[PDB]
């Protein structure tokens, strides 16, 4: 039902068994070596059209939680940046570690943040997220680093719903949440072709990792680790860590905007 996980017996190092692509040529995340970042005059500023974003529910997916958005129409889309076309926001989720010194999937010159936010979008040229996820130009995910420091009020509404989705599969109504409240003021970004960091690990993601992190308090981070990987009736298993480590960059180029 979701055999893969982040434990020693089913963690990232074993995903390749059920998902051979785990050892693919465009796997994410990757460490971003700023010294090797390339400047592409063709890159444009990110166009996050989230004004009419309509959040629906928060769901415990068995490895983290998703804040789902109505992607039935172009209510909240991602355009420009390194993209061609329109990409609808379908859901966002986070990745975190068991301690504040780790948790982010992408790293900056080996630097790890406490957590990492992923805003998932899909190319409207495909009719649906699933079909989109099968094409290299199908998905666009904006990664946002959460840096331990000042408590972040915008993160409040999210943390408050966690006690309502403790176990795998549990969901809760989660209306009127502005996804843009989780974005930094400066939208400088790094971009490279990659994949979803969780199985099926499809290589259809144009990664857009923001250079500027947003804040989160150590106390707020404790909150993320209170969730359960398990379904009610199963042994309790806390969601202490759900990040995939950096994967081989291989023949990929990380571009940076504005540089
Ligand atoms: Zn993710």
DSSP string, the chain: -----SSTTTSTTTGGGT-GGGGSSS-S--EE-GGGPEE-TT---EEEE-TT--EEEEEE-SSSEEEEE--SSSSSEEEETT--S-EEEEEEEEEE-SSTT---SSEETTB--SEEEEEEEEEGGGSSHHHHTTSTTSEEEEEEEEEESS--GGGHHHHHHGGGS-STT-EEE--S--GGGGS-S---EEEEEE--SSTT--S-EEEEEESS-EEE-HHHHHHHTTSBSSPBTBPP-B-----PPP---TT---EEE--
Domains in the chain, start-ordered, CATH in brackets? 1-259 (3.10.200.10)
Which residues pair with residue 26 across a beta bridge? Answer: none
Q: How far is the CA of 96 from the centre of ligand 1 (A)?
A: 10
Beta-carbon contacts of 184 under 8 Å, excluding residues fewer than 6 positions away, are: 144, 210, 212, 213, 214
CB atoms within 10 A of CB 27: 23
In the reported structure, the alpha carbon of residue 251 is separated from the centroid of ligand 1 by a whole-number distance in angstroms of: 22
Task: From 50, 43, 54, 46, select the one nearest 79 (Cα to Cα).
Answer: 46
Whether 63 is catalytic:
yes
Question: Burial letters for 141-164: b for 16+ Cβ neighbours within 10 Å, e otherwise?
Answer: bbbbbbbbeeebebbebbbebbee
Active-site choice (2, 3, 9, 63) = 63
Which approach determined this entry?
A: X-ray
**What is the spatial distance between Cα 89 and Cα 182, in angstroms, rounded to a whole number?**
14
Cα 145 to ligand 1 centre (Å): 12
Q: Which residues contact 47 (CB under 8 A, 6 or more apart)?
A: 78, 79, 80, 81
Radius of gyration of the chain from Cα atoms?
17
Query: Does 9 count as an annotated binding residue?
Result: no
Structure tokens at 238: 């806390």
Q: Would the annotation count 206 as a binding residue?
A: no
Residue linked to tokens 């106390």: 219
Is the Cβ–Cβ distance between 240 and 226 less than 8 Å?
Answer: no
54 is an annotated ligand-binding site residue: no
What's the CA-to-centroid distance between 67 and ligand 1, angstroms?
12
**Beta carbons within 8 Å of 93's beta carbon, 6+ residues apart:** 61, 64, 65, 66, 67, 117, 118, 120
- The C-alpha atoms of residue 228 and residue 60 are separated, in whole angstroms, by 8
> What is the distance between the alpha carbons of residues 242 and 128, in angstroms, rounded to a whole number?
26
Ligand 1 geometric centre to CA of 118 (Å): 5
Does 121 show up as a binding residue in the annotation? no
The CA-based angle 225-17-240, given to 5 degrees, is 5
Q: Yes or no: say if 209 and 30 are a contact pair by the CB < 8 Å rule.
A: no
Question: Which residue is listed with tokens 């996050």?
Answer: 48
Residue 172 annotated as lining a ligand binding site:
no
Name the token pair of 34: 């700023």
């Amino acid at each position: 039902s979701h055999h893969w996980g982040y434990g020693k017996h089913n963690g990232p190092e074993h995903w390749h068994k059920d998902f051979p692509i785990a050892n693919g040529e465009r796997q994410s995340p990757v460490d971003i070596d700023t010294k090797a970042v390339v400047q592409d005059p063709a890159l444009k500023p990110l166009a996050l059209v989230y004004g009419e974003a309509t959040s629906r529910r928060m769901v415990n997916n068995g490895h983290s939680f998703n804040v789902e958005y109505d992607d039935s129409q172009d209510k909240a889309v991602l355009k420009d940046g390194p993209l061609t076309g329109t990409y609808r926001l379908v859901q966002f989720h986070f990745h975190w570690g068991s301690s504040d010194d780790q948790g982010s999937e992408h790293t900056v010159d080996r630097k790890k943040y406490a957590a990492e936010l992923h805003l998932v979008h899909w190319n409207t040229k495909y009719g649906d997220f699933g079909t989109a996820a099968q094409q290299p130009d199908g998905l666009a995910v904006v990664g946002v680093f959460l840096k331990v420091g000042d408590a972040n009020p915008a993160l409040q509404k999210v943390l408050d719903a966690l006690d309502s989705i403790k176990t795998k599969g549990k969901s809760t109504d989660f209306p009127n949440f502005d996804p843009g409240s989780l974005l930094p003021n400066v939208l400088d970004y790094w971009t490279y072709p990659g994949s979803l960091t969780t199985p099926p690990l499809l290589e259809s993601v144009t990664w857009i990792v923001l250079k500027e992190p947003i804040s989160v308090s150590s106390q707020q981070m404790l909150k993320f680790r209170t969730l359960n990987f398990n379904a009610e009736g199963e042994p309790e298993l806390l969601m202490l860590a759900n990040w995939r480590p950096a994967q081989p960059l291989k023949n990929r180029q990380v571009r940076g905007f504005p540089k």
